[PDB]
C-alpha cells in the first residue's frame, strides 16, 4: 500500500492522472492509518489538495457540477483524515486549513453539488470538534465558525442542520465555549434566537436527531446563570408542551434532557 500511496501522491502532479489518484488515495483513508502524516509530509501534497478547493471558488453564480463536487469532496475527505490524525491536527490548525472550507459553509446555493460540498466540509469541522480538544475549540472560536453554523442551522437541509448543530453543541459543551457565547448578551441571544427558530421549524417538519441536538444545546446553556435567567423568560413553549409527543415517544434520552432543562430553570 505504501508504494501505491507514493505513486498516487506523485500522480497528483499531472492533470491526466490527478482525479484517479485523488479517488485512490481517498479509498486508502479507511485502511492505512499512517496516511495522514504521509500526506502531510510529502512535499506538495497538502498544497495540491488545497488547489482542488480554491479552483472551485469561481464556481460559487453557482456553476459547480456533480463531477467537480465529487472530486473536491475527495480532497476534503483527505483533509478530514489529516484533521483526525493526532500527529497532524495541530499543524492543520496552525496552517489555518479550516479557513479554506468556510466559503463552502457560507454559500446559500441550493444545488445538490453544493450540498455534497457543504456536508463534507461540515464533516471536516465535525471531525475536529469531535476531539473536544481545547486547541480545536479555541481556534474555532477565534475564526468565527459559529455565525456560519447558525446560518446553516437556520436554513440548511435537515442533515446540514444536524451537523452544524452538533458543531455548535461541541463548542457549547466546552467551558471556554460556553463562557464565550454567554460573555455578551448579543452572542447569547444570536444562539438562542437561532435555536428558537429551529424549534419552530421542527414543529412543522419533525426530525428526532435534529431535535435531540437542539435540546442538548439548550440543556448546556442552562449551566450558565445569565443564560439560565434569560431562558426562564424565553424558552420556547414547544419544548414544554405536547408539540413533540409523537417524535419523542421512543427517545428516553431527549425526554430526560428536556426534564432536566426545565428543572434547571428553577
Amino acid at each position: 500500500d505504501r508504494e501505491k500511496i507514493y505513486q498516487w501522491i506523485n500522480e497528483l502532479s499531472s492533470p491526466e492522472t490527478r482525479e484517479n489518484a485523488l479517488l485512490e488515495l481517498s479509498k486508502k483513508r479507511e485502511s492505512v492509518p499512517d496516511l495522514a502524516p504521509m500526506l502531510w509530509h510529502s512535499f506538495g501534497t497538502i498544497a495540491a489538495l488545497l488547489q482542488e478547493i480554491v479552483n472551485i471558488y469561481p464556481s460559487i453564480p453557482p456553476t459547480l457540477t456533480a463531477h467537480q463536487s465529487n472530486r473536491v469532496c475527495n480532497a476534503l475527505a483527505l483533509l478530514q483524515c489529516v484533521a483526525s490524525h493526532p500527529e497532524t491536527r495541530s499543524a492543520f490548525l496552525a496552517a489555518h486549513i479550516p479557513l479554506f472550507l468556510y466559503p463552502f459553509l457560507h454559500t446559500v446555493s441550493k444545488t445538490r453539488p453544493f450540498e455534497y460540498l457543504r456536508l463534507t466540509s461540515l464533516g471536516v469541522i465535525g471531525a475536529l470538534v469531535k476531539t473536544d480538544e481545547q486547541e480545536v475549540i479555541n481556534f474555532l472560536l477565534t475564526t468565527e465558525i459559529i455565525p456560519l453554523c447558525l446560518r446553516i442551522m437556520e436554513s440548511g437541509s435537515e442533515l446540514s442542520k444536524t451537523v452544524a448543530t452538533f458543531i455548535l453543541q461541541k463548542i457549547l459543551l466546552d467551558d471556554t465555549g460556553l463562557a464565550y457565547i454567554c460573555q455578551t448578551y448579543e452572542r447569547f441571544s444570536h444562539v438562542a434566537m437561532i435555536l428558537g427558530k429551529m424549534v419552530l421549524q421542527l414543529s412543522k417538519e419533525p426530525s428526532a436527531r435534529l431535535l435531540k441536538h437542539v435540546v442538548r444545546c439548550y440543556l448546556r446553556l442552562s449551566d450558565n446563570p445569565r443564560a439560565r435567567e434569560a431562558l426562564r423568560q424565553c424558552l420556547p413553549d414547544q419544548l414544554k408542551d405536547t408539540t413533540f409527543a409523537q417524535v419523542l415517544k421512543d427517545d428516553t434520552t431527549t425526554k430526560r434532557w428536556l426534564a432536566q432543562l426545565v428543572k434547571n430553570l428553577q
Binding site: 481517498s26 457540477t65 456533480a66 463531477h67 463536487s69 465529487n70 469532496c73 475527495n74 476534503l76 475527505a77 478530514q80 483526525s84 444545488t111 445538490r112 453539488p113 450540498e115 455534497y116 456536508l119 463534507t120 461540515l122 464533516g123 465535525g126 471531525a127 469531535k130 442533515l159 444536524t162 451537523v163 452538533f166 436527531r209 441536538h213 427517545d251 428516553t252 434520552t253
Partner: peptide, 28 residues
C-alpha cells in the same frame, strides 16, 4: 432538480460516510 448521475451518487455516499464517522445518532 432531481437528476442523479454517477458523480451525484458517489459524492452523496462519500458525504454520508464522512458524516457517519461523527456518531450523530448516538444515545446518551
Amino acid at each position: 432538480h432531481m437528476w442523479e448521475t454517477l458523480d451525484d451518487q458517489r459524492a452523496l455516499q462519500l458525504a454520508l460516510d464522512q458524516l457517519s464517522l461523527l456518531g450523530l445518532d448516538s444515545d446518551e
